[PDB]
Design a binder for this molecule. Structure first.
Ligand code: APC
Ligand code: APC
Ligand code: CO
Ligand code: CO
Ligand code: CO
Ligand code: CO
Ligand code: CO
Ligand code: CO
Ligand code: CO
Ligand code: CO
Ligand code: CO
Ligand code: CO
Lengths: 339, 343
């Protein structure tokens, strides 16, 4: 029956963000004896590795994802913004990159591949980051991403571990994209219906980085694959504190709520939920906890600041053209309290 | 009647035999990326096209490369270590020294298990330790077809980076590792061979190209690359095309595993060998038996360096190599006719 290209149908049904598990990940790595040196400032555990050389603080990160929209050009641009996000999350400036392309020449074709690259290039141009090469491998399930090298000007870098009790938790982009992507995959939604989320996914976190630094944030991370709760916990766990988050204060797309209540969501949201339930204190309905756990693609920065900094926050945000939402505060008890 | 309750896990059985023929040959991707408006800057010394990207910052010459491969053996630890040596190879091929890296892991938590994944990582870490390269992080994604590799950043001491573009007619072609691994890997995949039949090949795939880099720099090589996916003819051709010259390769001087020859003659070789042979068909001048051309076109994994040196360096090639403890084979010479002559 039934009276363009569909990339999503080439991804294994009912996904997440294709990642392979939360915290337990960086925990495996911890059990190994890794060669490191005097230049290694931050190794495994944060949004990016930090390495000093010739007096310069470089940051390095890599991220690859499966299709999140059916338009190849937009997938390329969004994946690029996603990879660059971790540089911004460290307070760094992207400098150069390499592309990692997994695609099957007969399950698609050069034309589609060229559109993904074009989207990536245009976003790198906007981020003034130079693509220096890459690698392409035959893969039935298409994936695209980048390894990125950046610099932290004047040697200042923001990790996930300096947060203090009594600080405000600030978020710069809404959550709920994973739900929308599941909606597109099932053919219930089209790109036009989620133009606002697409715009947020395409947006570079460079303006949020500036805002973040301007407010002298103590800790910072970006919200991606492990959901808002999982990424908030990384700050908590690394700073040895807790967080109280108010569901009512969290920005999300109305459509994400309508779909999630109809049990339409990526299986990844459930896995993220299950991982944090070991430190979660909440009596909210599950549709709320699934929404808060939902994998986010190219999400905003999540950081901590002092109330006192709220003085010129909206002014700063304005001139910078970046939104922000106060979603909660850090607490002494090492738990995640969602009210 | 006595079934092993213990699990098996054949990494090689999880690798797919693509039914799609390679459209991208030696240098094509570079030509393709030219039909794009790419943002670049004054610090970009070498962009898309060589073994690594070259970028200048306050006088420091950095090189960047990335490579990920599917399993080439069944041992997880060996696979991780080989993949690591393979990724570092491109930094060495530029004359650089690897500094730090990030790991890219594609694995299925249910068609394998954390324990095997830990073994891949352990092999990678031990090889990076040997390379004095710091692993700084990475990304892990769920994938039915296991894949593993690294993006690496290195530095070219004294600002000398060697490209595929500076060779000239009359120079000698030097290779530092045997070819033929693609055929051996195919034999392992078909259950014809076992790891124990290819210990020598495994040792070579595990070896870092650092000593070869020292030999290459000591002889002031004019051009260099490493032999990987496009086979010996294909990678030799990359130097030729970028240096606008041709090459004469003497099969009798080319190093390869005896088992690789026996296998090709019985048609046990990867389809990639036919695809690599097809890529160079319009520039190939040869009347050798075809098993020879197939072997010379066979995709190599974590291969050696391939570089050009002026004829007068021979006087010190041998003493320098013994000192450095690295093998080398003089397999040919560059020529004026932009053709690939295989004798
Ligand atoms: N295969 C691997 N090898 C080494 N380090 C790895 C790794 N996979 C992940 N890591 C590290 O383990 C931590 C968690 O990885 P990720 O979840 O990818 C962080 P992220 O990129 O900020 O989130 P995102 O993947 O949802 O975008 C990071 O420090 C990451 O660098
Ligand atoms: N997806 C991509 N985006 C940008 N550049 C890419 C790319 N894929 C490959 N390239 C570049 O195109 C040229 C050929 O790629 P490769 O064949 O991967 C070089 P190599 O790593 O030396 O060979 P190998 O892959 O057999 O190990 C290189 O300059 C590579 O950096
Ligand atoms: Co991150
Ligand atoms: Co990262
Ligand atoms: Co990330
Ligand atoms: Co490559
Ligand atoms: Co950070
Ligand atoms: Co190479
Ligand atoms: Co490379
Ligand atoms: Co390579
Ligand atoms: Co990641
Ligand atoms: Co080179």
């Amino acid at each position: 029956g039934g009276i363009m290209v569909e990339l999503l149908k080439l991804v294994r049904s009912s996904g997440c963000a294709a990642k392979v598990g939360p915290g337990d990940l960086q925990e495996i790595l911890k059990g190994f004896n890794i060669y490191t040196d005097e230049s290694t400032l931050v190794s495994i555990g944060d949004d990016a590795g930090v390495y000093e050389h010739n007096g310069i603080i470089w940051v390095y990160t890599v991220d690859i994802i499966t299709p999140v929209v059916n338009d190849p050009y937009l997938w390329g641009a969004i994946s690029t913004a996603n990879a660059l996000s971790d540089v911004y999350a460290m307070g760094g400036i992207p400098v150069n990159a390499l592309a990692i392309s997994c695609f099957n020449n007969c399950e698609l074709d050069i034309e589609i591949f060229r559109e993904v690259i074009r989207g990536a290039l245009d976003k790198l141009r906007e981020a003034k980051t130079v693509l220096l090469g890459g690698h392409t491998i035959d893969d039935k399930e298409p994936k695209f991403g980048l390894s990125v090298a950046g610099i932290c000007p004047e040697g200042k870098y923001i990790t996930q571990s300096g947060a203090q009790v009594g600080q405000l938790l600030i978020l710069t982009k809404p959550i709920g994209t994973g739900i929308l992507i599941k909606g597109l995959k099932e053919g219930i939604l089209k790109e036009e219906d989620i133009n606002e989320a697409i715009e947020n996914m395409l947006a570079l976190n460079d303006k949020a980085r500036n805002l973040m630094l301007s407010l002298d944030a103590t800790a910072c991370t970006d919200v991606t694959g492990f959901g808002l709760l999982g990424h908030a916990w990384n700050i908590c766990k690394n700073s040895n504190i807790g967080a109280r988050i108010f569901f009512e204060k969290v920005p999300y797309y109305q459509l994400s709520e309508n779909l999630v209540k109809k049990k339409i969501y990526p299986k990844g949201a459930i896995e993220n939920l299950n991982f944090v339930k070991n430190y979660l204190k909440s009596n909210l309905d599950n549709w709320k906890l699934i929404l808060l756990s939902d994998p986010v693609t190219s999400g905003g920065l999540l950081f901590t600041i002092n109330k006192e900094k709220l003085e010129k926050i909206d002014e700063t945000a304005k001139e910078l053209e970046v939104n922000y939402w106060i979603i909660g505060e850090t607490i002494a008890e090492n738990v995640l309290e969602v009210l």
